[PDB]
Design an enzyme around this catalytic site. Structure first.
Site, short mmCIF file in Angstrom:
data_model
loop_
_atom_site.label_atom_id
_atom_site.label_comp_id
_atom_site.label_asym_id
_atom_site.label_seq_id
_atom_site.Cartn_x
_atom_site.Cartn_y
_atom_site.Cartn_z
CG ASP A 106 -1.80 1.21 1.32
OD1 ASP A 106 -1.93 1.92 0.31
OD2 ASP A 106 -2.41 1.42 2.40
CB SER B 208 -2.11 14.36 -13.43
OG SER B 208 -2.54 14.13 -14.76
#
Length: 330
Positions: free
Chosen positions: A35, A199
């Site tokens: 994770d 992004s």
């Protein structure tokens, strides 16, 4: 040193991925959920409340000659999906794919929430976010990667998640045969303890690319792709019959649909998520309403590039003095 381990979806939907981990001496192999959105390595154990164990493999520290109680240490964690676990702490030898760390903090669960009990395939979590998020008190502990880093050939790990197929986590090297083209690297902020990056935009299907900054985290422990409501609405508007359902808890779409791809930007590069990756199947057995793999982050407080996004790429988690993230197509 290096390590290399195969990671395998737990079910036909890729709801999560499990990777075998050797703990203790002799080795006890548990299948953990790696994770990159948390920083605790915790396991079902011989100390876990019996009624909260249902099929998981447990770590039994009393059977490990290298286990030592970390005296006074406790831990307690809550995840974004509302699940939680807590317990005490041992140090022991932990190996992943041939890479060994001695003195790793292994957090033994005394209590786990229902979601964990109900998932027989996940024996615990191995956190790979920054150690500043580790929950051990009163002495915070280091992640497996942080402990391994100095011994690694290069201070990196890579995630290569499969779509309905196994994939690979590598530590200490970049497998140049595992991706196509070049890797585009992008800046990371560690201020919130995550692999947080921005992004450069998105496209829906064959549509034009929208240049816009989307800050979010690379999180292998989250199944879906969570993005701003504007972006998510633009995606689902291209699917006839798709709608957001408060009763189901997100966007659903007719199972008869063909989903468009979704592209996200990494600097000047583009990662394309095929439409099929966005299908999470019937909301309930036999239903013709299917759950979407792109959902709104509104009210999460952060955008999450979960498995839906990451499995479309070869992803480099660069833990150099100034960390960065790299993405390649594959």
């Amino acid at each position: 040193s290096t390590g290399s381990a195969t990671t395998t979806p737990i079910d036909s939907l890729d709801d999560a991925y499990i990777t075998p981990v050797q703990i203790g001496t002799p080795a006890q192999t548990l299948n953990l959920d790696f994770d990159t959105g948390s920083s605790d390595l915790w396991v079902f154990s011989s100390e876990t409340t019996a009624s909260e164990v249902d099929g998981q493999t447990i770590y039994t520290p009393s059977k490990s000659t290298t286990a030592k109680l970390l005296s006074g240490a406790t831990w307690s964690i809550s995840y974004g999906d509302g699940s939680s676990s807590s317990g005490d702490v041992y140090t022991d030898t932990v190996s992943v794919g041939g890479l060994t760390v001695t003195g790793q903090a292994v957090e033994s669960a005394k209590k786990v929430s229902s979601s964990f009990t109900e998932d027989s395939t996940i024996d615990g979590l191995l956190g790979l976010a920054f150690s500043t998020l580790n929950t051990v008190s009163p002495t915070q502990q280091k992640t497996f990667f942080d402990n391994a880093k100095a011994s690694l050939d290069s201070p990196v790990f890579t995630a290569d998640l499969g779509y309905h197929a196994p994939g690979t986590y590598n530590f200490g090297f970049i497998d140049t045969t595992a991706y196509t083209g070049s890797i585009t690297y992008t800046a990371v902020s560690t201020k919130q303890g995550f692999w947080e990056w921005t992004s450069t935009g998105y496209a829906v299907g064959s549509g034009t690319f929208k240049s816009t900054s989307i800050d979010g985290i690379a999180d292998t422990g989250t199944t879906l792709l969570y993005l701003p409501a504007t972006v998510v609405s633009a995606y689902w508007a291209q699917v006839s019959g798709a709608k957001s359902s408060s009763s189901v808890g997100g966007y659903v779409f007719p199972c008869s649909a063909t989903l468009p791809s979704f592209t996200f930007g990494v600097g000047s590069a583009r990662i394309v998520i095929p439409g099929d990756y966005i299908d999470f199947g019937p909301i309930s057995t036999g239903s013709s309403s299917c759950f979407g793999g792109i959902q709104s982050s509104a009210g999460i407080g952060i955008n999450i590039f979960g498995d839906v996004a990451l499995k479309a790429a070869f992803v480099v988690f660069n833990g150099a003095t100034t960390p960065t993230l790299g993405f390649a197509s594959k």
